[PDB]
Amino acid sequence: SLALSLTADQMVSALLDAEPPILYSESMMGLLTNLADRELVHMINWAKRVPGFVDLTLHDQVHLLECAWLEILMIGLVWRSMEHPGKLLFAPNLLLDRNQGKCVEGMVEIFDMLLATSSRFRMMNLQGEEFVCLKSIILLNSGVKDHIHRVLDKITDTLIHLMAKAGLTLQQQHQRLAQLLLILSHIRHMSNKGMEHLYSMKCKNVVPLSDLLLEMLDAHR
């Protein structure tokens, strides 16, 4: 509901309105953990302001958030890094490059992938209206006809609407649509490797993950 009641333009406004802010950072994983932890609080209220997410029961909201939280964190990072070739903008004061990835395990491998994804969006001239549509999809597609599928269709129709507005032809629309959704697979991949290393250095007792991050992490393991 609600989501299925919005026109394409009204769907966009609601998502742009729902947008969480860009935060600032407060040893490398410590700053990234602290930032992530504070970002997660904003993400939850962001999710609640995603049309059709509240229609779901509390149980399904927990699952989808426990499944998508790192994916969503990564597409945000990748989005705001676009204006910085070869560097990652975790925060306006924390602009890291590939080389800051060393010392800590798996970071430089994940950085490369995040940088690669950022270049992809950069070459595609990704727009904010498209960005908020993709973030909503990741949330709804993280798990696991029905409600969630009906909303995903609405967001797809919205993306198509955005492209047509930009002046894209029918052929260019389904190609770009495909191109965007394919990158989401890379986002899933990077997130998977992220949590895998996260759980590992959690076992190794290296980085002190916050309570919220400890819970999210165990939702996978």
Partner: peptide, 10 residues
């Protein structure tokens, strides 16, 4: 309960 569970409520 869980922090995510509580925050979604309010």
């Amino acid at each position: 309960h869980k922090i995510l569970h509580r925050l979604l409520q309010d």
